[PDB]
Amino acid sequence: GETLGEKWKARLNQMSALEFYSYKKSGITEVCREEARRALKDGVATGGHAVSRGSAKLRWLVERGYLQPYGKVIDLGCGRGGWSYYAATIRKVQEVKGYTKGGPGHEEPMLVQSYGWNIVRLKSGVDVFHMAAEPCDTLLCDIGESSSSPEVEEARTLRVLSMVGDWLEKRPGAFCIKVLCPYTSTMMETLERLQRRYGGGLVRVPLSRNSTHEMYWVSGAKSNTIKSVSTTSQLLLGRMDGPRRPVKYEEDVNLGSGTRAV
Ligand SMILES: Nc1ncnc2c1ncn2[C@@H]1O[C@H](CN(CC[C@H](N)C(=O)O)Cc2ccc(F)cc2)[C@@H](O)[C@H]1O
Ligand SMILES: [Cl-]
Ligand SMILES: [Cl-]
Ligand SMILES: [Cl-]
Ligand code: NA
């Protein structure tokens, strides 16, 4: 039986360019990035700006208690560093190590001086699938590239989750892991097994675009896998009908400036 998410994906692939353009942000939550983009383009490192939209996504989770970062944070797939720099502002966090592949077509770490920047070490040139897991207190991972093929998205998600398992075996107390494809029958079974083994639960972040079914597996959630995924599928399906709905806005995160004592 085709799941609601698989029905959503088939409809998404049937949309014309114009339908997709109007659908992808219909009714979502967004931060306005115009000020940060201008400041970062002008080389301003001290204005508090987030380096990417990722800081707002992690903020949404942390402010609601979906995880409580602390201690040594490892950020797999850090990109420019939006999760790493947000984590560095958190009182209980004491060290942030981000790893990202970089190279052609992939974002490099951005060096800025938001609050806590001196406890952040971002390393490019690192493929985390070839990296030995190391102990940490908080494990973050934001890897997963969209594909028009749900079979490709499932294969990519299984690859991420297999890799993350090696890190979870070190028993971090807090975690946030992107799940690109939660919506196939096989994926829901896999995620249920992983929740039984490592805990946590799935949450949909409302800053995600309607064009992806990504959910985050986070240590502070506790929810039925099938219900949480199906509720998201129905939400995304419902937004395909009717008029385009307005975007809702937070102000972009401001991460301040200055160093931290450690
Ligand atoms: N195997 C990999 N090893 C290391 N880094 C990788 C690997 N595969 C992908 N990446 C990089 O992961 C980043 C994913 N970003 C992270 C955003 C970050 N949390 C922030 O807040 O700035 C999200 C993402 C972007 C594009 C996309 F298509 C899928 C995910 C990227 O920089 C990858 O190069
Ligand atoms: Cl990715
Ligand atoms: Cl991927
Ligand atoms: Cl929950
Ligand atoms: Na690059």
Residue numbers in the entry: 5 to 266
What does the paper say about this structure?
A methylated 5′-cap is a key feature of both flavivirus genomic RNA and host messenger RNA, required for RNA stability and translation. In flaviviruses, the 5′-cap (N7MeGpppA2′OMe; where Me is a methyl group) is formed by the activities of two enzymes: NS3 that encodes a protease and helicase, and NS5 that encodes a methyltransferase (NS5-MTase) and an RNA dependent RNA polymerase. The NS5-MTase domain methylates both the N7 and 2′O atoms in a sequential reaction: GpppA2′OH-RNA → N7MeGpppA2′OH-RNA or “cap-0” → N7MeGpppA2′OMe-RNA or “cap-1”, using S-adenosylmethionine (SAM) as the methyl donor and generating S-adenosylhomocysteine (SAH) as the reaction byproduct. Defects in 2′O methylation attenuate the virus and is a basis for vaccine development. Together, these features make ZIKV NS5-MTase an attractive target for the development of antivirals.
We determine the thermodynamics parameters of binding of MS2042 to ZIKV NS5-MTase and elucidate a high-resolution (1.55 Å) structure of MS2042 bound to ZIKV NS5-MTase (NS5-MTaseMS2042). We postulated that a 4-fluorophenyl group attached to the Cε atom of the methionine portion of SAM would have the capacity to bind a portion of the RNA binding tunnel that spans the SAM and 7-MeGpp binding sites. The asymmetric unit contains two molecules of NS5-MTase (molecules A and B) related by two fold non-crystallographic symmetry. Overall, the core of ZIKV NS5-MTaseMS2042 adopts a Rossmann fold (residues 54–223) with seven β-strands (β1-β7) and four α-helices (αX, αA, αD, αE). Amino acids belonging to the catalytic tetrad (Lys61-Asp146-Lys182-Glu218; a feature of 2′O methyltransferases) adopt the same conformation as in ZIKV NS5-MTaseSAM and NS5-MTaseSAM,7-MeGpp structures. Overall, the NS5-MTaseMS2042 structure is very similar to the NS5-MTaseSAM and NS5-MTaseSAM,7-MeGpp structures with r.m.s deviations of 0.17 Å (247 Cα atoms) and 0.18 Å (254 Cα atoms) respectively, indicative of little or no change in the protein conformation in accommodating the extra 4-fluorophenyl group of MS2042. The SAM portion of MS2042 overlays almost exactly with the SAM in the NS5-MTaseSAM and NS5-MTaseSAM,7-MeGpp structures, wherein the adenine ring is sandwiched between the side chains of Lys105 (partially disordered for chain B) and Ile147, and the N1 and N6 atoms establish hydrogen bonds with the backbone amide of Val132 and the side chain of Asp131. The 4-fluorophenyl group of MS2042 extends into a shallow cavity, adjacent to the SAM binding pocket. There are no specific hydrogen bonds with any amino acids and the fluorine atom projects into the solvent. Most of the contacts between the 4-fluorophenyl group and the NS5-MTase are van der Waals in nature, wherein one edge of the phenyl ring (C2-C3) runs parallel to amino acids (146-Asp-Ile-Gly-Glu-149) in the NS5-MTase loop connecting β4 and αD of the Rossmann core.
